[PDB]
């Protein structure tokens, strides 16, 4: 007896492609690698309950290649498999609302993803890939499973891997519209003189070396090629936020002097992030957990500040 069902294949879960599948054969034999809401059904034969359902496949014809690139803005061949594999886990995570923001209950070392997600909801940022636009919209509303899986895929992290918040934000920033952002810096060595530099996009909003936006404006000491120590300070800044980062060190966060920050406790190969946000008071969101304090001191590695336009006074 020949037995078939109709299903739909997709790469973006919007554009559907009608298929007829033979119930005596696996999905793999008919589509190649096949997924049902994240689950790998490649080695599985069609079930009656599969009729009418949407299955993800890999882009193995030109029409799917174009749909996938337009939706995700990547042509990494392993992207979709990595996204599905992550999603099969992130759809089981919980996404509690904590002080008005979508967080993530701790699981699978995802603390770095929680503080990244919490941070995104406090800074002005638009993603370019439609996949991130759509998934971020849902994540804000509370259904963050697809967004978290996409973050993992874009950053080439698997569920359970330890992540770095700064690196994760770098990847997300690459897929955001920061074209308007501009940074002008000046480096002063007393043996070589001055030298001014201009940064754009992602490099205009990220700095590594100090957590303090004010100290960045006043000046910070760095090496120079002659062996002398030079001073770098901020000449001009155009962006809706800035991100200051440093290796984790004890730091004091004051209410109303910053938007949010990331705290890291542990070592290089093992640790835990928490999120601090400055609202009517200082709230520490640790996944599903919430505490408050008027003052805060702890090992801070990233601090986020609001900005529109800043011009320096140093002549
Ligand atoms: C450079 C050769 N590939 C082309 S033009 N399409 N591939 C697209 C594509 C492939 C993936 O694995 C994931 C997402 C995608 O958008
Ligand atoms: Cl089966
Ligand atoms: Cl899991
Ligand atoms: Cl967006
Ligand atoms: Zn010099």
UniProtKB/Swiss-Prot annotation:
Annotated catalysed reactions: Thiol-dependent hydrolysis of ester, thioester, amide, peptide and isopeptide bonds formed by the C-terminal Gly of ubiquitin (a 76-residue protein attached to proteins as an intracellular targeting signal)
Residue ranges annotated for the Peptidase C16 domain, each copy included: 71-315
Residues covered by the Ubiquitin-like domain: 2-57
Compartment(s) where it occurs, according to its Swiss-Prot or TrEMBL record: Host endoplasmic reticulum membrane
Membrane topology: Multi-pass membrane protein
Means of activity regulation: Inhibited in vitro by GRL-0617.
Role: Responsible for the cleavages located at the N-terminus of the replicase polyprotein. Participates together with nsp4 in the assembly of virally-induced cytoplasmic double-membrane vesicles necessary for viral replication. Antagonizes innate immune induction of type I interferon by blocking the phosphorylation, dimerization and subsequent nuclear translocation of host IRF3. Also prevents host NF-kappa-B signaling. In addition, PL-PRO possesses a deubiquitinating/deISGylating activity and processes both 'Lys-48'- and 'Lys-63'-linked polyubiquitin chains from cellular substrates.
Protein name in UniProt: Papain-like protease nsp3
Naturally occurring in which organism (per UniProt): Severe acute respiratory syndrome coronavirus 2
Lineage: Viruses, Riboviria, Orthornavirae, Pisuviricota, Pisoniviricetes
Included range, full protein: 1564 to 1878 of 4405
């Amino acid at each position: 007896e020949v037995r078939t069902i109709k299903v739909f294949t997709t790469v973006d879960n919007i554009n559907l492609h009608t298929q007829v599948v033979d119930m005596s054969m696996t999905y793999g034999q008919q589509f190649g690698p096949t997924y049902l809401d994240g689950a790998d059904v490649t080695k599985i034969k069609p079930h009656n309950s599969h009729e009418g359902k949407t299955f993800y496949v890999l882009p193995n014809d030109d029409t799917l290649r174009v749909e996938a690139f337009e939706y995700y803005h990547t042509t990494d061949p392993s992207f979709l498999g990595r996204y599905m594999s992550a999603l099969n886990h992130t759809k089981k995570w919980k996404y509690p609302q904590v002080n008005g923001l979508t967080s993530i209950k701790w699981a699978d070392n995802n603390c770095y993803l929680a503080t990244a997600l919490l941070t995104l909801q406090q800074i002005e940022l638009k993603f370019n890939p439609p996949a991130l636009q759509d998934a971020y919209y849902r994540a804000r509303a509370g259904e963050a499973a697809n967004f978290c899986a996409l973050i993992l895929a874009y950053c080439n992290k698997t569920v359970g891997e330890l992540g770095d918040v700064r690196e994760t934000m770098s990847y997300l920033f690459q897929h955001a519209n920061l074209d308007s952002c501009k940074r002008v810096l000046n480096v002063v060595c007393k043996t070589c003189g001055q030298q001014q530099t201009t940064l754009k996009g992602v490099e205009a909003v990220m700095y590594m070396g100090t957590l303090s936006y004010e100290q960045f404006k006043k000046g910070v000491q760095i090496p120079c090629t002659c062996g002398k120590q030079a001073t770098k300070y901020l000449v001009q800044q155009e962006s809706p936020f800035v991100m200051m980062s440093a290796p984790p060190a004890q730091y004091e966060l004051k209410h109303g002097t910053f938007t949010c920050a990331s705290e890291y406790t542990g070592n290089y190969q093992c640790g835990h992030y928490k999120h601090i946000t400055s609202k009517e008071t200082l709230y520490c969101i640790d996944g599903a957990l919430l505490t408050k304090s008027s003052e805060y001191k702890g090992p801070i590695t990233d601090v986020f500040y609001k900005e529109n336009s800043y011009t320096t006074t140093i002549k």
